[PDB]
């Protein structure tokens, strides 16, 4: 069925080029609110314990996620076995001496793969014993995503959560843009008579997008929709390069 996956991905490239000519986007409009997405979280290869507990924190962060083990899983048959499992997103974590550095999000049914550098992390497994996470299907909040690339990353980044939470649904997850650095925290709260009081729990980090390829994770022949430009002579002069 390699001719089937090639024909469907060639149809996908045509649909993306046609939508970019006549500019929820094209890749997600079939399943914007119907199917609750499932997320497979993996590490790089022979992970460290600190990276593994960070991946456990990420699996606990956004629901319908399993933390699949990664040792001697070859990447192409990994992603096609994930396709035959028929889940939706893959999330790969690359570390450096226990500090995680790369978070690759791949919406693998012929969809986009974004890649994020992941700068200042804080792990609740090595700070705070306060109990379990809340694990309710959360609310999401986003701060000044106004660029077209910002709308694209907020689409592929909020289309991995549980669709349609309730009013009582407690935990909120923030994605704040502070000059092309998506800062992530997540909180629970109550409503006081004075107002609202938040409680920081779970991870915190900030991620900078650096590649956003139209193909799947394994190919490396994927046409680049966007990647940053580190070495132009106007790099530090604008945002969403």
């Amino acid at each position: 069925m390699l001719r089937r996956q090639a024909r469907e991905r060639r149809e996908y490239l045509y649909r993306k080029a046609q939508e970019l000519q006549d500019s929820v986007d094209d890749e997600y409009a079939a399943t914007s609110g119907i199917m609750d997405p499932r997320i497979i979280v993996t590490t790089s290869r022979d992970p460290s314990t600190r990276l593994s507990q960070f991946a456990k924190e990420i699996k606990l962060l956004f629901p319908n996620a399993v933390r699949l083990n990664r040792g001697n899983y070859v990447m192409p048959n990994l992603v096609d076995a994930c396709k035959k499992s028929g889940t939706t997103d893959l999330v790969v974590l690359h570390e450096h001496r226990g500090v995680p550095t790369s978070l690759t999000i791949s919406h693998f049914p012929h969809g986009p793969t974004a890649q994020f550098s992941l700068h200042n992390v804080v792990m609740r497994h090595d700070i705070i014993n306060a109990g379990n996470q809340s694990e309710v299907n959360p609310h999401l909040i986003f701060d000044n995503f106004t660029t077209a690339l910002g709308k694209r990353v907020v689409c592929i980044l909020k289309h991995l959560f549980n669709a349609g939470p309730k009013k009582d649904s407690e935990r909120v997850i923030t994605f704040a843009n502070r000059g092309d650095f998506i800062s992530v925290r997540q909180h629970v709260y109550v409503r006081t008579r004075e107002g609202v009081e938040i409680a920081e729990v779970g991870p915190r980090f900030e991620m900078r997008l650096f590649e956003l390829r139209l193909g799947t994770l394994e190919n490396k022949d994927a046409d680049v929709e966007w990647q940053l430009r580190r070495f132009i002579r106007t790099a530090n002069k604008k945002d969403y390069l």
């Binding site: 109990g131 379990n132 996470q133 809340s134 407690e170 629970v188 109550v190 009081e197 409680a199 729990v201």
Partner: peptide
Amino acid sequence: QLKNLKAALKA
């Protein structure tokens, strides 16, 4: 988290 936080903030 919510249990002990809400109990300590109301009481």
